[PDB]
Ligand binder design. Structure first.
Ligand code: NI
Length: 341
């Protein structure tokens, strides 16, 4: 049954709640972003209104075959009325098409649901700045001080410089990047751009990328692998066996693989600077784990909440254990006492 933290009080609305069958009293189902833990349950047989971004609605129609009459895309940064309630969708700085949702309840309460997000000071100057928020449904993925990671910009600089160096030294090296969902497209796009190549991929993955309104995409991606020296593969194939097998398939065009696994966090973050990251190597294959995150770090999350000053916080991640819940609640109290709200 639907958990409480997916229900918006005083409305007929739920958020990211498609795997519970028909939710009692739900008149509109919101979807923050097209990641499987959030869309789980949608298909061509869904007949209730779904409210989402334009990008998310492209992916629902083309990838899951949801019928067009039940998709309600909304523009960003625009006041809209849904079943008698004012809502705004804001950019979440997560994956393409990901939003945060502001609900203006009939009784004067204002609620922000962050979906999944990477907090940023740029958010302090959206339509959030203009009114008080009473309740915050917060992406608490990395809500503990051990979770530090670099800026996205520093990680992309590392990747571009590493790839460019390797292929200039050996023009017969192939670069491979892992993927299993939308998000983190800058990794493979930035590498292809520095090398003057398109990114090659499966037909399924090309289809997914064509849904995302990325400018000049026909210019950066392709299904012709033979013409590309940056290849995208499923994340599960980014290991020595799977990469040896792929190299076999390229027919002696290449004699070395440099592969990238964009992870969120890994404990090598608590000790090592991005400058200092090294690969795992076996023979002519090297694998780099790079800490490219599309969730808030602890410090980024703290700064956002201390700026927003909500009256109540409802965590949406790590809610299944008492030890996690208690940890989280202790940090929320610290933040409130330090800032004075
Ligand atoms: Ni997500």
């Amino acid at each position: 049954t639907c958990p409480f933290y997916k229900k918006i009080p005083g409305t007929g609305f739920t958020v990211d709640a498609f795997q519970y069958g028909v939710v009692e009293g739900c008149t509109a189902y919101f979807l923050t972003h097209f990641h499987s833990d959030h869309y789980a349950g949608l298909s061509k047989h869904f007949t209730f209104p779904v409210y989402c971004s334009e990008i998310t609605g492209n992916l629902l129609k083309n990838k899951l075959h949801v019928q067009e009459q039940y998709i309600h895309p909304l523009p960003l940064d625009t006041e809209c009325i849904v079943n008698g309630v004012k809502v705004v969708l804001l950019d979440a700085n997560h994956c393409p098409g990901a939003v945060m949702i502001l609900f203006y309840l009939p009784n004067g309460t204002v609620i922000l649901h962050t979906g999944d997000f990477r907090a940023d000071p740029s958010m302090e100057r959206s339509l959030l700045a203009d009114q008080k928020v009473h309740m915050l449904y917060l992406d608490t993925t990395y809500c503990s001080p051990e979770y530090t990671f670099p800026s996205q910009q520093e990680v992309i600089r590392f990747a571009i410089n590493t790839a460019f160096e390797a292929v200039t030294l050996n023009p017969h090296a192939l670069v491979v990047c892992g993927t299993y969902s939308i998000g983190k497209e800058k990794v493979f796009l930035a590498i292809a751009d520095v090398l003057g190549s398109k990114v090659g991929m499966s037909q399924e993955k090309y289809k997914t990328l064509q849904c995302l309104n990325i400018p000049e995409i026909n210019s950066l991606i392709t299904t012709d692998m033979c013409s590309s020296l940056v290849h995208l593969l499923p994340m599960m194939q980014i290991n020595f066996k799977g990469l040896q097998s792929h190299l076999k398939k390229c027919g002696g065009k290449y004699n070395q693989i440099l592969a990238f696994r964009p992870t969120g966090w890994t404990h090598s973050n608590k000790f090592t600077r991005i400058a200092d990251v090294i690969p795992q190597t076996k023979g002519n294959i090297s694998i780099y784990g790079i800490p490219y995150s599309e969730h808030s770090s602890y410090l980024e999350m703290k700064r956002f909440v201390q700026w927003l000053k909500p009256q109540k916080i409802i965590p949406t991640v790590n809610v299944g254990t008492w030890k996690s819940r208690s940890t989280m609640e202790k940090y929320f109290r610290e933040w409130k006492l330090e800032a004075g709200y």
